Ligand binder design. Structure first.
Ligand SMILES: Cc1cc2nc3c(=O)[nH]c(=O)nc-3n(C[C@H](O)[C@H](O)[C@H](O)COP(=O)(O)OP(=O)(O)OC[C@H]3O[C@@H](n4cnc5c(N)ncnc54)[C@H](O)[C@@H]3O)c2cc1C
Ligand code: NA
Ligand code: NA
Lengths: 133, 666, 10
């Protein structure tokens, strides 16, 4: 009812190899062909990848910037407000970005800002202008 | 088993059922109450037991009833019927027993038996035992037929039958109690030496042996679970099946390699896209960084758009940098995944050359046990005798197997050097025409009530005919004869003056260089006490080596032997002998095999006796005149001495029922 | 523990 384990006998396969006098050596040459061509492609892409890895030599280390550690403050300076408006103009609704720019405000403080000052900063307008981009 | 059930098992009978044969003789009993069936059955098994427990003397009915116990010894006619059936069909009082009741004063009927092979001798002895005039005609100058034992001095070596294939249910058991046979176990351990002379490493011996066995199982599965028996209007052979199974294994291996290397390209290409992504990102980071530097360039005090510019560029750079770093993590993971796949590649091949060659030696072992190229065996039926194989270790005969035919021939009217030329069988009797083999001008004519033909299937197969039948055998018999397979196998006896091999090793192999020569001198035996090695030739190689001179052949032998044992340790054989069984005109081959296109049903056809048409027309149907025995005629035990023996017992029983009448059936 | 029986076709 079941073939020996490690013995692979499929119906499809037996009819495919019995059909002819040398359908056997045909299938087994096509597979050798498939094999050599796949191995060749591996060579190609191993090479391609070797080149790309060569380009990335140097990491991004010369370009990394140290991290500002400013503690979150609750008071909005005039400055911080202005930063914030421009931040909205450039980033729209990406609050996290905005918080990172201002550097001493949290995301929720940023949302609060959105609402409190909506009247006075014409935040609506600002936002639609960001959306045009 | 043990007890009376032991006896029944040993008599190749089911201890708890009546057989078809028994049904035939005792239809009253088997269509009756299960009780009397059990009585019957005990009477049977017990009588069997008694015979078996001491087969050196005739078991008379009186003795039997004497040792029967009640209630079983009440119905004495049941006992008599039973005993008689047993004696008749050679379940008891067969072989070489001391006769209590000395033979019948006058004989009834006349039987001429062609061939004093083992089957011949058997039937003859039984028929005589029954009080019939029996004469055997034998073409050779010796008894035994395909039991052929070489002797010179103390050197003794069979070129014919060599092995008792187990004593569990073997009649040869009874014989060996009756004859002095030095039986010797065979140590089934067999080292293999590669054509060079180096032993095959245990690792290899085992990986290969195991793969062999799996391939066989495979074919069986193709056969029986898949009905792959017929391929293109032509029946499949074991050999073809094997080759297909193998081709699929190689196919599967290439498939595995293709799937693996494709996983490697899939991943490698992932890495490619990631790498691209990372390079473009790095370039953006270079550019952006430049821009941020240019913005910190502007010294304070600066207005708020300027300040926003620095802050925003900074936020963006920290962003892109973060992203690049994640990508680089991913790159690490992919690279190590690729090192894993490049690390666990599936198996390079299915079989190396050393591989396929050792495998070829296992195939040659198969070709040898069947005496034929695996390309000729029936896929569906080659193994069909396997269900009846005996139990216990296979054994050799140290004094030679000849002793048995010889033993049997005692008391028998045997005409040697008498080659039967033609058989004539008619409504009224038979005449056999034979010649002297020495002077084939001299002629003999033998007249008889029936002929027992135990001509080898090879002989019967001959074209043009070595023996002529008048009238001709009916198409159904001749077709059966054509359909069967009569195969071929040969031996080389090597007699040296001192043992130069491992004396604890009964047997050892040699692996052939080619697939084609896989059967040439593939195996060797030391079974004799004396220094004698036996080199075996089977498969396609069997037939071909027969056209090569003795000398060349012992040459290829000592060659192999020197390769394995060193040129300075192997000496010229004092005596050498080489079988050529297909060439022998009395054998015309070694033994039958289920040819592809044949079935075990053909063996049954072979055993069907022939009934001549009436002499006068509109005259009643006549009694059968021609009967067949021998190894080719026994379905469950073909190509064996015990099979020959059994077929002999059979036909003698049938013949005797015919001409003497069966008193035990009322 | 030998593979094939010894002289059976099996
Ligand atoms: C090499 C070899 C090894 C074997 N090893 C084994 C083994 O190890 N174990 C086992 O169980 N079996 C073995 N066998 C087979 C076994 O020996 C046979 O099955 C058995 O001997 C067959 O007996 P038989 O009585 O049917 O035929 P045979 O023994 O052949 O007897 C028939 C007789 O007919 C004679 N004859 C032929 N033509 C004529 C003619 N025109 N006129 C008159 N007489 C004629 C023959 O010469 C012969 O004597 C082996 C066979 C061979 C060839
Ligand atoms: Na015979
Ligand atoms: Na093969």
């Amino acid at each position: 009812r079941k073939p020996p384990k490690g013995m692979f006998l499929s119906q499809e396969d037996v009819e495919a190899v019995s059909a002819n006098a040398t359908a056997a050596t045909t299938v087994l040459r096509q597979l050798d062909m498939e094999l050599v061509s796949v191995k060749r492609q591996i060579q190609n892409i191993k090479q391609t990848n070797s080149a790309l890895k060569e380009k990335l030599d140097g990491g991004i280390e010369p370009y990394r910037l140290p991290e500002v550690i400013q503690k979150c403050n609750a008071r909005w300076t005039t400055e911080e407000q202005l930063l914030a408006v421009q931040a909205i103009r450039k980033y729209g609704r990406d609050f996290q970005a905005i918080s990172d720019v201002i550097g001493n405000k949290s995301v929720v403080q940023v949302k609060n800002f959105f609402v409190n000052y909506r009247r006075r900063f014409n935040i609506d307008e600002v936002l639609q202008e960001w959306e045009a981009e | 088993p043990s007890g009376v059930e032991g006896a029944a098992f040993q008599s190749r009978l089911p201890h708890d059922r009546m057989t078809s044969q028994e049904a035939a003789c005792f239809p009253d009993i088997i269509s009756g109450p299960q009780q009397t069936q059990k009585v019957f059955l005990f009477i049977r098994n017990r009588t069997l037991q008694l015979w078996l427990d001491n087969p050196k003397i005739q078991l008379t009915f009186e003795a039997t009833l004497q040792q029967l116990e009640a209630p079983y010894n009440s119905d004495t006619v049941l006992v008599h019927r039973v005993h008689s059936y047993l004696e008749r069909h050679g379940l008891i009082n067969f072989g070489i027993y001391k006769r209590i009741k000395p033979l019948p004063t006058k004989k009834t009927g006349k039987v001429i038996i062609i061939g004093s092979g083992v089957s011949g001798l058997a039937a003859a002895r039984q028929l005589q035992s029954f009080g019939m005039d029996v004469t055997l005609l034998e073409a050779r100058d010796r008894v035994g037929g395909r039991v052929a034992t070489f002797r010179k001095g103390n050197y003794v070596a069979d070129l014919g039958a060599m092995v008792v294939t187990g004593l569990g249910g073997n009649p040869m058991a009874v014989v060996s109690k009756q004859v002095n046979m030095e039986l010797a176990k065979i140590k089934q351990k067999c080292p293999l030496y590669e054509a060079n002379g180096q032993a095959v490493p245990k690792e290899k011996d085992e990986m290969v042996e195991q793969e062999f066995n799996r391939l066989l199982e495979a074919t069986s599965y193709l056969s029986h679970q898949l009905d792959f028996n017929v391929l293109n209007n032509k029946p499949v052979s074991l050999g073809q099946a094997l080759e297909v199974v193998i081709q699929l294994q190689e196919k599967h291996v290439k498939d595995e390699q293709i799937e693996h290397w494709k996983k490697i390209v899939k991943t490698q290409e992932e890495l490619k896209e990631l790498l691209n992504k990372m390079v473009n990102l790095k370039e953006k980071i270079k550019e952006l960084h430049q821009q941020y530097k240019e913005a910190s360039e502007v010294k304070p005090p600066r207005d708020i758009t300027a300040e926003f510019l620095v802050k925003s560029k900074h936020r963006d750079l920290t962003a892109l940098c973060k992203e690049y770093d994640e990508l680089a993590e991913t790159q690490g993971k992919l690279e190590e995944k690729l090192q894993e796949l490049e690390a666990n590649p599936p198996s390079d091949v299915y079989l190396s050359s050393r591989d396929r060659q050792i495998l070829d030696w296992h195939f040659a072992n198969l070709e040898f046990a069947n005496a034929t190229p695996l390309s000729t065996l029936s896929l569906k039926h080659w193994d069909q005798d396997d269900d009846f194989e005996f139990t216990g270790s296979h054994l050799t005969v140290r004094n030679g197997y000849s002793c048995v035919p010889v033993a049997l021939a005692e008391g028998l009217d045997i005409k040697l050097n008498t080659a039967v030329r033609q058989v004539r069988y008619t409504a009224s009797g038979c005449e056999v025409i034979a010649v002297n083999t020495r002077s084939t001008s001299q002629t003999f004519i033998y007249k008889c009530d029936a002929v027992l033909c135990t001509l080898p299937l090879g002989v019967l197969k001959q074209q043009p005919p070595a023996v002529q039948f008048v009238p001709p055998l009916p198409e159904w018999k001749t077709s059966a004869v054509q359909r069967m397979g009569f195969g071929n196998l040969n031996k080389v006896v090597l007699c040296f003056d001192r043992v130069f091999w491992d004396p604890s090793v009964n047997l050892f192999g040699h692996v052939g260089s080619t697939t084609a020569s896989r059967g040439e001198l593939f195996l060797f035996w030391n079974l004799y006490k004396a220094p004698i090695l036996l080199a075996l030739v089977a498969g396609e190689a069997a037939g071909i080596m027969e056209n090569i001179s003795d000398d060349v052949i012992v040459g290829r032998c000592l060659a192999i032997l020197k390769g394995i044992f060193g040129s300075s340790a192997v000496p010229q054989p004092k005596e050498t002998v080489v079988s050529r069984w297909r060439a022998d005109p009395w054998a015309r081959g070694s033994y039958s095999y289920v040819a592809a296109g044949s079935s075990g049903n053909d063996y049954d056809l072979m055993a069907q006796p022939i009934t001549p048409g009436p002499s006068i027309p509109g005259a009643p149907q006549p009694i059968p005149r021609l009967f067949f025995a021998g190894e080719h005629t026994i379905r469950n035990y073909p190509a064996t001495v015990h099979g020959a023996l059994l077929s002999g017992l059979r036909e003698a029983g049938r013949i005797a029922d015919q001409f003497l009448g069966a008193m035990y059936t009322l | 523990x030998x593979x094939x029986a010894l002289l059976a076709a099996x």
